[PDB]
């Protein structure tokens, strides 16, 4: 069920997030406190001691002073809080104080799901955004060569039959994606595509 910290840590490095990548964190990722450098990370929604539940991606652009929060489902902070017991306020607090002069910062995020409700490709997508972020961090969410391959759909439409032919089609091209760029992906591809399948959560 899903991708493990090592899996993600290895793939994120195949996708070149290397120079910019701050590791994998439980729900208590500090923020971007270090210096004003293009940084990014992977933060689990849950605390390490649950075993770990959902993967999130987080990015910092210098120019724009913008935290990108990326949930492959585009759940709102309010929904993420409700489903996953997750909030990242004091996260942005530390960050915007650590890094911004006026102590202000922009929070940019999806309203739009790329994942199927049942899928467990949650890190693999997070990894895909972390490739788009580390090459076009000014426009990471859409209109770059990495997300132009993917098709966002209104979050609120998630539990709907109309969407899934597109939500499967993101998940094929997400595999095409990683296969193309990650040596570790190809190496583990079969067990990865099996453990993160479209319908894993009813293949449990």
């Amino acid at each position: 069920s899903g991708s493990s910290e090592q899996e993600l840590a290895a793939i994120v490095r195949d996708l070149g997030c290397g120079p910019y990548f701050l590791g994998t964190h439980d729900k208590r990722f500090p923020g971007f406190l270090a210096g004003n450098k293009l940084a990014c990370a992977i933060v689990n929604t849950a605390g390490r001691e649950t075993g770990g539940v959902h993967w999130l991606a987080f990015g910092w652009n210098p120019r724009s002073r913008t935290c990108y929060m990326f949930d492959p489902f585009g759940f709102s902070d309010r929904r993420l809080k409700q489903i996953y017991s997750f909030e990242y306020e004091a996260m942005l607090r530390r960050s915007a104080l650590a890094l911004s002069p006026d102590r202000c910062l922009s929070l940019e995020q999806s309203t739009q799901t790329v994942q199927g409700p049942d899928s467990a490709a949650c890190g693999l997508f997070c990894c895909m955004f972390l490739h788009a972020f580390v090459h076009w961090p000014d426009r990471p969410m859409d209109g770059n060569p990495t997300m132009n391959l993917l098709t966002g759909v209104p979050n609120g439409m998630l539990q709907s039959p109309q969407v899934l032919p597109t939500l499967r089609r993101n998940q094929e091209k997400l595999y095409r994606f990683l296969a193309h760029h990650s040596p570790y992906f190809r190496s583990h591809r079969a067990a990865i595509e099996h453990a993160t399948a479209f319908d894993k959560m009813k293949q449990l």
Partner: peptide, 11 residues
Amino acid sequence: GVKSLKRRRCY
């Protein structure tokens, strides 16, 4: 890719 919403926060 995905639509998004940018929210200017301050602290």
